[PDB]
Design an enzyme around this catalytic site. Structure first.
Site, PDB file in Angstrom:
ATOM      1  N   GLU A 185      -1.943  18.473   3.207  1.00 21.64           N
ATOM      2  CA  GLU A 185      -2.538  19.745   3.598  1.00 21.64           C
ATOM      3  C   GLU A 185      -1.557  20.573   4.416  1.00 21.64           C
ATOM      4  O   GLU A 185      -1.459  21.793   4.235  1.00 21.64           O
ATOM      5  CB  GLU A 185      -3.826  19.503   4.382  1.00 21.64           C
ATOM      6  N   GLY A 229      -3.219   4.311  -4.662  1.00 21.33           N
ATOM      7  CA  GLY A 229      -4.371   5.121  -5.000  1.00 21.33           C
ATOM      8  C   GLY A 229      -4.029   6.490  -5.548  1.00 21.33           C
ATOM      9  O   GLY A 229      -4.929   7.249  -5.918  1.00 21.33           O
ATOM     10  N   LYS A 231     -12.312  11.682  -2.407  1.00 18.00           N
ATOM     11  CA  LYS A 231     -11.076  12.156  -3.036  1.00 18.00           C
ATOM     12  C   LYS A 231     -11.105  13.658  -3.311  1.00 18.00           C
ATOM     13  O   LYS A 231     -10.511  14.127  -4.285  1.00 18.00           O
ATOM     14  CB  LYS A 231     -10.776  11.392  -4.330  1.00 18.00           C
ATOM     15  N   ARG A 243       2.954  13.368  -6.597  1.00 14.21           N
ATOM     16  CA  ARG A 243       1.519  13.148  -6.433  1.00 14.21           C
ATOM     17  C   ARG A 243       0.792  14.480  -6.570  1.00 14.21           C
ATOM     18  O   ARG A 243       0.926  15.363  -5.717  1.00 14.21           O
ATOM     19  CB  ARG A 243       1.221  12.493  -5.088  1.00 14.21           C
ATOM     20  N   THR A 244       0.015  14.623  -7.640  1.00 15.24           N
ATOM     21  CA  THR A 244      -0.594  15.894  -7.992  1.00 15.24           C
ATOM     22  C   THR A 244      -1.826  16.166  -7.132  1.00 15.24           C
ATOM     23  O   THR A 244      -2.232  15.355  -6.296  1.00 15.24           O
ATOM     24  CB  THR A 244      -0.954  15.910  -9.474  1.00 15.24           C
ATOM     25  N   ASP A 247       0.855  -1.183   0.000  1.00 10.44           N
ATOM     26  CA  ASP A 247       0.000   0.000   0.000  1.00 10.44           C
ATOM     27  C   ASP A 247       0.890   1.231   0.000  1.00 10.44           C
ATOM     28  O   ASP A 247       1.733   1.380   0.889  1.00 10.44           O
ATOM     29  CB  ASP A 247      -0.925  -0.005   1.210  1.00 10.44           C
ATOM     30  N   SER A 307     -11.880   9.229   1.668  1.00  7.49           N
ATOM     31  CA  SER A 307     -11.166   8.393   0.708  1.00  7.49           C
ATOM     32  C   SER A 307     -12.038   8.065  -0.497  1.00  7.49           C
ATOM     33  O   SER A 307     -11.556   8.057  -1.636  1.00  7.49           O
ATOM     34  CB  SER A 307     -10.685   7.112   1.386  1.00  7.49           C
ATOM     35  N   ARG A 327      -5.681   4.311  -8.451  1.00  6.30           N
ATOM     36  CA  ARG A 327      -6.961   5.014  -8.335  1.00  6.30           C
ATOM     37  C   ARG A 327      -8.045   4.102  -7.767  1.00  6.30           C
ATOM     38  O   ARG A 327      -9.217   4.197  -8.137  1.00  6.30           O
ATOM     39  CB  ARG A 327      -7.396   5.595  -9.682  1.00  6.30           C
ATOM     40  N   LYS A 334      -9.933  -2.363  -2.845  1.00  8.66           N
ATOM     41  CA  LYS A 334      -8.836  -3.077  -2.201  1.00  8.66           C
ATOM     42  C   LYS A 334      -9.339  -4.340  -1.513  1.00  8.66           C
ATOM     43  O   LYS A 334      -8.794  -5.435  -1.712  1.00  8.66           O
ATOM     44  CB  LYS A 334      -8.139  -2.168  -1.188  1.00  8.66           C
TER      45      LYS A 334
END
Ligand SMILES: *[C@@H]1O[C@H](CO)[C@@H](O[C@@H]2O[C@H](CO)[C@@H](O[C@H]3O[C@H](CO)[C@@H](O)[C@H](O[C@@]4(O)[C@H](O)[C@@H](O)O[C@H](CO)[C@H]4O)[C@@H]3O)[C@H](O)[C@H]2NC(C)=O)[C@H](O)[C@H]1NC(C)=O
Ligand SMILES: Nc1ncnc2c1ncn2[C@@H]1O[C@H](COP(=O)(O)OP(=O)(O)CP(=O)(O)O)[C@@H](O)[C@H]1O
Ligand SMILES: *[C@@H]1O[C@H](CO)[C@@H](O[C@@H]2O[C@H](CO)[C@@H](O)[C@H](O)[C@H]2NC(C)=O)[C@H](O)[C@H]1NC(C)=O
Ligand SMILES: *[C@@H]1O[C@H](CO)[C@@H](O[C@@H]2O[C@H](CO)[C@@H](O)[C@H](O)[C@H]2NC(C)=O)[C@H](O)[C@H]1NC(C)=O
Ligand SMILES: *[C@@H]1O[C@H](CO)[C@@H](O[C@@H]2O[C@H](CO)[C@@H](O)[C@H](O)[C@H]2NC(C)=O)[C@H](O)[C@H]1NC(C)=O
Ligand SMILES: CC(C)CCC[C@@H](C)[C@H]1CC[C@H]2[C@@H]3CC=C4C[C@@H](O)CC[C@]4(C)[C@H]3CC[C@]12C
Ligand SMILES: CC(C)CCC[C@@H](C)[C@H]1CC[C@H]2[C@@H]3CC=C4C[C@@H](O)CC[C@]4(C)[C@H]3CC[C@]12C
Ligand SMILES: CC(C)CCC[C@@H](C)[C@H]1CC[C@H]2[C@@H]3CC=C4C[C@@H](O)CC[C@]4(C)[C@H]3CC[C@]12C
Ligand SMILES: CC(C)CCC[C@@H](C)[C@H]1CC[C@H]2[C@@H]3CC=C4C[C@@H](O)CC[C@]4(C)[C@H]3CC[C@]12C
Ligand SMILES: CC(C)CCC[C@@H](C)[C@H]1CC[C@H]2[C@@H]3CC=C4C[C@@H](O)CC[C@]4(C)[C@H]3CC[C@]12C
Ligand SMILES: *[C@@H]1O[C@H](CO)[C@@H](O)[C@H](O)[C@H]1NC(C)=O
Ligand SMILES: OC[C@H]1O[C@H](O)[C@@H](O)[C@@H](O)[C@@H]1O
Ligand SMILES: [Mg+2]
EC number: 7.6.2.1
Lengths: 910, 364
Positions: free
Chosen positions: A286, A468, A332, A387-388, A152, A329, A582, A588
């Site tokens: 954040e 993800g 998103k 990671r955008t 993960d 989650s 994604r 999962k």
């Protein structure tokens, strides 16, 4: 009795040990085969007792034997009930093959293995002070058969230390950086990375110095610090004031305001300097966004009940926050609505996934070209491992915002599963937004993760990655680590883009055609009914190193349909890489359950975070990483380790050791019981199975408790297949734990056959020494008593069983050998102690009489030899002529190949 | 902190040796075992072939016997001497009836005269051998009260319904008395009255004397104590009535502490054949010559087609004559040597590198 009461204390002591070792549910895989073996042992007992009852009753109708003159047995019953009582007494004597201590010995050994796991220094993370605590004790041997490791990307592979590096604003890529990911990508390309890396690093240092100088000359901030300025774009500091017009300047201002405002971070004063702040949040991204926005000029501090205090290039103002919708989650995205004055309007700003925001994007007010520029910038960022995060804004009049608020406080303020109505309201309000750019954040891997994955993949484990973040960053991270090595091609199953035109239809047919094709040209494997039967039976081994890439939609469609499900299952049986990107937590759990249930195999589900607990819970061996604040993944897990770099020890050392130890214990535990009960039976062929007991009444309750029950436990607890150093150096040994080539019913049946033969040898040597004249006492006084013959047989059996345990032990330590000698000493000394007592009325002199007879030793030595000779000869003509990998490895490191590395060594250490 | 305590035992780093069965240290082991066991087997056969024994069955001394000096049929006598392997010398045997007793099933006296062409040094054991007498059945071996053996005057309350070891069907008689040596074991004593001397025939001046003192382990004298009954509540077992026709009185109580013949019968035999010591001689060597033995015939045998007889031997350090130990040592040594040669040939013919790294399952 004494065969069932002294177990009640042990079965609660073993739990008190767990309770003591915890203040500081589901079974294993070998348990089912253990139950089957116990059933077959009862079948053997039943057939033996049936034969005994059949014979006892045949001779009651025979010639006038010597039982009708001296025994007064004149009763009108021979087979109607006398055979019944003979069978009942036979079974009550043969209860020895009723294993009750097996379910106690196995519990003791599993608990000891778990404790030895918990007290390993190499399983200790010094930085966080968290030893590897096993939450569940039953699963300790399940680590030796792992075939799939569902990793993960959240917090296991990468530490959640976010670092802002780049950001796209209105088609301008503000940000230049150079990290290990860029060097890895360049090395993949082939160009040099040392001199070019140094030149780029010095240029980046110069750019950062110019940036900080311009920022200092621009204005002053109460929280500016030159140590947290990871953002190295001098192209934004100039654009901030006026240097590139106003269309770009205002867009950049709005971008940084969105970064500084859209957050969920709590603000606290610094412990040392009250002027300094120590903002903390559950989401590291954040926190990174807020920190870079504050350090670039737009500082955030304080928390008011209505509005947030913000410093803009010096001016200290107070906004008005209207509502905030948190980040989930499955959602998103995280949004917030505030007020902008001039009837003031409502500004809604949200940050979320690259694909989710594009899907939740308006088609009316857009530049029609900024979308493509932002998309290409984000793909470029992700290709290098960033990671955008997409930002979308929206302007609203007060009427529609007020209607939305009415809906929100009539639905999201209610009860009885409020979250569904909350999601409905959020998706209603987030259907028309304009993109205003994206950001780029990077995080490095843990310590030694590339080498850990190299070890894991070298040991035959076909590990998956249920990331993800997005497809491109996942591919880059797999390439940077060893999940995706060279000389491997990537079968992409993405149901869009370029692979949609070739099979233009609904995603159903698109994924069907693409999976079927790739499966057809890659292998001759087309089919969905019987090829699954070969897949189940062949037990698994990677070959023809490929890789598979799966999107969130591709995953959600490839496991919804039955034919889709088996086609995906057959395709993803490739060598070592399945990058699912994604994916939602439900996806999962679904894929883990698919791999586990169908084609029953062993599924490690290492993860970290409150969203992947569904993966840990709905798996077999759920390893929980103790990382960030989200420790919910540790409590509801099967294990707990400091960081990923420990799994390569928890699977390649402790797992293999435990699996081999139990697979060597169980057949010998059935052996030690057979070699005794069959001895009783062999005495039973004489005296016409009437019901006499060959041994004493005190060997029923001390043969499976003290005589030969300690060496087996020590073998199954303190046995090292190979020292942990060589196990690290040669992970390929773990392969034998995957193909089930160590614990199969053939081994147990052969061990029981050896037990039967050794029982024959054990009992029929004393009888053959007694059959001619029966006066073997070196002074003619005569032993002649079935208890002394029982002493002969028990001595032979105990010595043979202890030596059999000692032969099959891979490592002869000073502990197991000491307890084997001590078990023999217990047998001899306790026979001596109990025989010299009035409570042993009939026996009363076992030690003085039997043990002093040279005949006893003369028969004991030959019994020991003839018991172990077949097994030893077979082992010698099998460990020299058909040697397994383990024998070759042992010979190698005894020759002195692996004599350089110290004992406390593991490659997963920088 | 929470760091586990580092130790050589806690860290699975105990001092140890890892053995591998390399041919460098397997062939020496097999040769050592083979040599040692062949040596020991040869020694035991050499020492054991020297022992001599005389077995004479006499269950047919009543029905198939003459009042004159006959010869034992070749199906009964067995002489084994290590100095005369061609020594048949059929022994003689006579029957002397006794019409006083009414026990017509088997009674009288057997006169068995044999010849020993050698001598047995300083230790001669005369045993009574029984055959086809089941003395290991569940009911037979578990029926004898331990309290009476220990000497306590236990009553019917604790002799009939005690634990698993109790004399169930022979606890009390019809007159309310309880048998003193209760149980199917003591009720089935061997009643053949063996003599106290082997009477010579070539030289009557020197009879070879035997004493029945010390034919059991002395240790049992600390377990078989004199009874504490008042000869008014006990009676002999039903099969003992012919020995005490008038019952138990103040003086006829058998003191089982020194009754070695009965002590040897309270250990039931493990297997069908039974060999219990009944006469011992520890002082005088038995010179070669012809000897006579007179034996009572109280104990009936032919009713269950059994056998009984005498077994006279000097014994040895491993008991009587038994080739089994030497044979099995020879077999073990021969098998070890054969396996050593097999490994040697299969190693010189299917040879391979010892630490062959290019033979692993994943390197091919
Ligand atoms: C030595 O040991 C042997 C065997 O252990 C003894 O032989 C046994 O002798 C007893 C009698 O002394 C005999 O018992 C039964 O004998 C008759 C068989 O049918 C039977 O008539 C007899 O019955 C009476 O004794 C009973 O009280 C009753 O039946 O009444 C009659 C009168 O009507 C009376 O005569 C008794 O039941 C055993 O059968 C016999 N053993 C065997 C195997 O047959 C031997 O006597 C012992 N000798 C010494 C010197 O101790
Ligand atoms: N505070 C936040 N608000 C909005 N979006 C966020 C966010 N933090 C992360 N995201 C992005 O939005 C997406 C939402 O997915 P989420 O982060 O819940 O699980 P995930 O597996 O897709 C990413 P991860 O593996 O780091 O948890 C993520 O892909 C992430 O890149
Ligand atoms: C050796 O034993 C024999 C056999 O009992 C003895 O011979 C008997 O002796 C008694 C008493 O002297 C006589 O009444 C018998 O008539 C004898 N029988 C025979 C056949 O001779 C002999 O006396 C014993 N010898 C010694 C020295 O005690
Ligand atoms: C062998 O010699 C011993 C030693 O004297 C004899 O044992 C004695 O036997 C007499 C019986 O006549 C007893 O009164 C003594 O008490 C015994 N003494 C000891 C020390 O045991 C034994 O009887 C002799 N045996 C033979 C067959 O001659
Ligand atoms: C107790 O009973 C026994 C039974 O054997 C008696 O012994 C018999 O009686 C005579 C007495 O005339 C004894 O001398 C013999 O030992 C036995 N007789 C024979 C022929 O051997 C014993 O006398 C009885 N005692 C009492 C006090 O009644
Ligand atoms: C492990 C077991 C099931 C393997 C088979 C056991 C066989 C070989 C053994 C067990 C019981 C034995 C039998 C027990 C009883 C007798 C009666 C006797 O007068 C002749 C031998 C004979 C007939 C034995 C022959 C061998 C025997 C049948
Ligand atoms: C790795 C495991 C399966 C090895 C198996 C070892 C045991 C089960 C095998 C190897 C040697 C075999 C023995 C070899 C010799 C004998 C004596 C022969 O007259 C009957 C078969 C018998 C009794 C075999 C029984 C089974 C046996 C003991
Ligand atoms: C799988 C098992 C049955 C293999 C048994 C091993 C065989 C070959 C060995 C072990 C026990 C041995 C038997 C033990 C007991 C007896 C009874 C004796 O009066 C004659 C020899 C005889 C008959 C032996 C013959 C050989 C024997 C049967
Ligand atoms: C009365 C008892 C308890 C005394 C102690 C008995 C033990 C400790 C002594 C006394 C007799 C001794 C044995 C006499 C004969 C032999 C046979 C030989 O091949 C190996 C040594 C061995 C086996 C001796 C070992 C030790 C021994 C068994
Ligand atoms: C009364 C006495 C003399 C009988 C002795 C019989 C002995 C000598 C015979 C009978 C059975 C025979 C055995 C039968 C089977 C084999 C197996 C073989 O691989 C080694 C030889 C061996 C072990 C034989 C050795 C000799 C042997 C044991
Ligand atoms: C006596 O035994 C011999 C041999 O044992 C036998 O030939 C003879 O027939 C037997 N006679 C009787 C009457 O049993
Ligand atoms: O008389 C024959 C027979 O009769 C009865 O069954 C019992 O007294 C037996 O002991 C005896 O042997
Ligand atoms: Mg996470």
């Amino acid at each position: 009795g004494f065969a069932s009461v002294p177990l009640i204390v042990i079965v609660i002591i073993t739990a008190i040990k767990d309770g003591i070792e915890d203040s500081r549910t589901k079974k294993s895989r070998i348990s089912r085969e253990l139950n089957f073996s116990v059933i077959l042992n009862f079948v053997l007992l039943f057939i033996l007792c049936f034969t005994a009852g059949i014979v006892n009753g045949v001779y009651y109708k025979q010639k006038p034997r010597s039982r009708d003159y001296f025994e007064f047995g004149t009763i009108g019953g021979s087979a109607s009930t006398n055979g019944f009582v003979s069978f009942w007494v036979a079974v009550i004597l043969y209860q020895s093959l009723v294993p009750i201590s097996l379910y106690i010995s196995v519990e003791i050994i599993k608990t000891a293995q778990a404790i030895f796991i918990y007290t390993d220094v190499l399983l200790y993370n010094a930085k966080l002070d968290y030893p590897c605590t096993p939450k569940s004790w039953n699963i300790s041997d399940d680590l030796g058969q792992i075939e799939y490791i569902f990793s993960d990307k959240t917090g296991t592979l990468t530490q959640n230390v976010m670092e802002f590096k780049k950001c796209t604003i209105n088609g301008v890529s503000y940000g230049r950086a150079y990290t290990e990911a860029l060097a890895g990508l360049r090395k993949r390309q082939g160009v040099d990375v040392e001199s070019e890396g140094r030149r780029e690093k010095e240029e980046i240092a110069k750019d950062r110095e110019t940036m900080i100088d311009e920022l200092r000359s621009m204005s002053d901030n109460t929280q500016f610090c030159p140590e947290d300025l990871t953002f190295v774009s001098k192209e934004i500091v100039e654009d901030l004031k006026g240097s590139s017009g106003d269309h770009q300047q205002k867009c950049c201002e709005h971008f940084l305001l969105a970064l500084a405002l859209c957050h969920s971070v709590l603000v606290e004063p610094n412990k040392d300097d009250p002027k300094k702040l120590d903002i903390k949040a559950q989401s590291p991204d954040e926190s990174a966004l807020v920190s870079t926005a504050r350090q670039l000029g737009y500082s955030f501090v304080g928390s008011s009940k209505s509005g947030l205090i913000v410093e803009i290039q010096g001016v200290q103002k107070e906004f008005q926050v209207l509502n905030v919708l948190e980040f989930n989650s499955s959602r998103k995205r995280m949004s917030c609505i505030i007020k902008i004055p001039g009837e003031p309007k409502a500004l809604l700003i949200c940050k979320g996934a690259d694909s989710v925001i594009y899907s939740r994007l308006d088609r009316t007010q857009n530049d029609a070209t900024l979308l493509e520029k932002t998309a290409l910038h984000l793909e470029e960022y992700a290709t290098e491992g960033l990671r955008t995060l997409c930002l979308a804004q929206r302007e609203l009049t007060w009427s529609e915002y007020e209607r939305w608020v009415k809906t929100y406080d009539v639905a999201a303020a209610s009860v009885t599963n409020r979250e569904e109505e909350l999601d409905k309201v959020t998706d209603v309000i987030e259907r028309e937004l304009i993109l205003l750019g994206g950001t780029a954040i990077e995080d490095r891997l843990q310590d030694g993760v590339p080498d850990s994955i190299a070890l894991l993949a070298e040991a035959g484990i076909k590990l998956w990655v249920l990331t993800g973040d997005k497809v491109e960053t996942a591919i880059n991270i797999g390439f940077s680590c060893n999940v995706l090595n060279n000389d491997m091609e990537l079968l992409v199953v993405k149901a869009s883009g370029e692979d949609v035109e070739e099979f233009g239809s609904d995603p159903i047919q698109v994924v069907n055609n693409l999976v079927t094709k790739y499966l057809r040209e890659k292998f001759g494997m087309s089919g969905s009914e019987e090829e699954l039967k070969e897949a189940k039976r062949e037990h698994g081994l990677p070959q023809g190193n490929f890789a598979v890439i799966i999107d969130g939609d591709a995953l959600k469609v490839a496991l919804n349909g039955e034919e889709m499900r088996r086609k995906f299952l057959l395709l993803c049986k490739n060598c070592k890489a399945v990058l699912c990107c994604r994916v939602s937590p439900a996806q999962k759990a679904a894929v883990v359950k698919l791999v586990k249930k169908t084609l029953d195999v062993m599924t490690l589900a290492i993860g970290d975070g409150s969203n992947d607990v569904a993966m840990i819970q709905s798996a077999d061996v759920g390893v929980g990483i103790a990382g960030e604040e989200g420790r919910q993944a540790v409590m509801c897990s099967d294990y707990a380790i400091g960081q990923f770099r420990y799994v390569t020890r928890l699977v390649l050392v402790h797992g293999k050791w435990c699996y081999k130890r139990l697979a060597e214990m169980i057949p010998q535990f059935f052996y030690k019981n057979v070699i005794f009960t069959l001895s009783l039976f062999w005495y039973g062929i004489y005296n016409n199975f009437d019901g006499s007991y060959l041994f004493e009444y005190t060997y029923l309750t001390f043969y499976n408790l003290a005589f030969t029950s300690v060496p087996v436990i020590l073998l199954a607890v303190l046995d090292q297949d190979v020292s942990d150093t060589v196990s690290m150096l040669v992970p390929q040994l773990y392969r034998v734990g995957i193909l089930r080539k160590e614990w199969n019913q053939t081994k147990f049946l052969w061990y029981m056959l050896d037990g039967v033969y050794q029982s024959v040898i054990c009992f029929f040597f004393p009888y053959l020494a007694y059959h001619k004249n029966m006066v073997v006492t070196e002074n003619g006084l005569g032993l002649d008593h079935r208890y002394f013959v029982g002493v002969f047989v028990t001595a032979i059996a105990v010595t043979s069983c202890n030596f059999y345990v000692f032969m099959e032990q891979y490592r002869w330590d000073w502990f197991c050998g000491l307890f084997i000698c001590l078990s023999l000493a217990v047998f001899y000394g306790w026979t001596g102690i109990w025989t010299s007592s009035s409570s042993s009325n009939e026996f009363y002199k076992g030690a003085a009489r039997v043990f002093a007879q040279p005949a006893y030793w003369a028969v004991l030595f030959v019994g020991v030899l003839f018991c172990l000779l077949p097994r030893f000869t077979i082992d010698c003509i099998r460990k020299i002529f058909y040697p397994k990998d383990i024998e070759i490895v042992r010979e190698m490191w005894l020759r002195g190949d692996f004599d350089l590395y110290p004992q406390g060594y593991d490659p997963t250490d920088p | 902190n929470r760091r586990p305590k580092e130790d050589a035992f806690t860290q699975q780093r105990l001092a140890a040796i890892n053995p591998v069965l390399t041919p460098r240290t397997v062939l020496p082991l097999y040769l050592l075992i083979a040599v040692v066991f062949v040596i020991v087997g040869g020694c035991i056969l050499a020492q054991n072939s020297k022992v001599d024994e005389v077995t004479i069955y006499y269950q047919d001394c009543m029905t198939n016997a003459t009042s004159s000096w006959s010869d034992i049929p070749s199906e009964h006598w067995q002489f084994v001497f290590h100095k005369y392997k061609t020594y048949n010398t059929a022994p003689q045997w006579r029957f002397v009836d006794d019409e006083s007793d009414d026990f017509t099933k088997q009674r009288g006296t057997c006169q068995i005269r044999f010849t020993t062409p050698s001598d047995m040094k300083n230790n001669v054991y005369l045993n009574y051998v029984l055959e086809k007498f089941a003395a290991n059945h569940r009911r037979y071996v578990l029926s004898f009260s331990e309290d009476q053996i220990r000497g306590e005057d236990a009553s019917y309350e604790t002799v009939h319904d005690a634990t698993g070891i109790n004399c169930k069907p022979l606890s009390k008689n019809a007159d309310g008395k309880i048998y003193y040596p209760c149980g199917l074991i003591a009720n089935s004593m061997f009643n053949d009255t063996f003599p106290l001397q082997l009477t010579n025939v070539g030289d009557t001046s020197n009879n070879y004397s035997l004493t029945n003192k010390g034919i059991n382990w002395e240790s049992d004298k600390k377990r078989y104590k004199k009874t504490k009954y008042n000869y008014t509540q006990i009676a002999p077992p039903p099969y003992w009535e012919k020995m005490y026709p008038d019952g138990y009185n103040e003086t006829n109580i058998p003191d089982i502490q020194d009754w070695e013949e009965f002590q040897n019968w309270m250990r039931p035999g493990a297997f069908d054949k039974i060999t219990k010591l009944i006469r011992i001689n520890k002082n005088d060597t038995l010179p070669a010559g012809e000897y006579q033995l007179d034996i009572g015939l109280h104990w009936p045998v032919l009713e269950f087609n059994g056998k009984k007889g005498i077994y006279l031997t000097h014994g040895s350090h491993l008991g009587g004559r038994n080739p089994f130990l030497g044979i099995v040592y020879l077999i073990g040594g021969c098998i070890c040597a054969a396996m050593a040669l097999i490994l040697l040939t299969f190693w010189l013919f299917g040879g391979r590198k010892i630490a062959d790294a290019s033979s692993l399952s994943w390197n091919m």
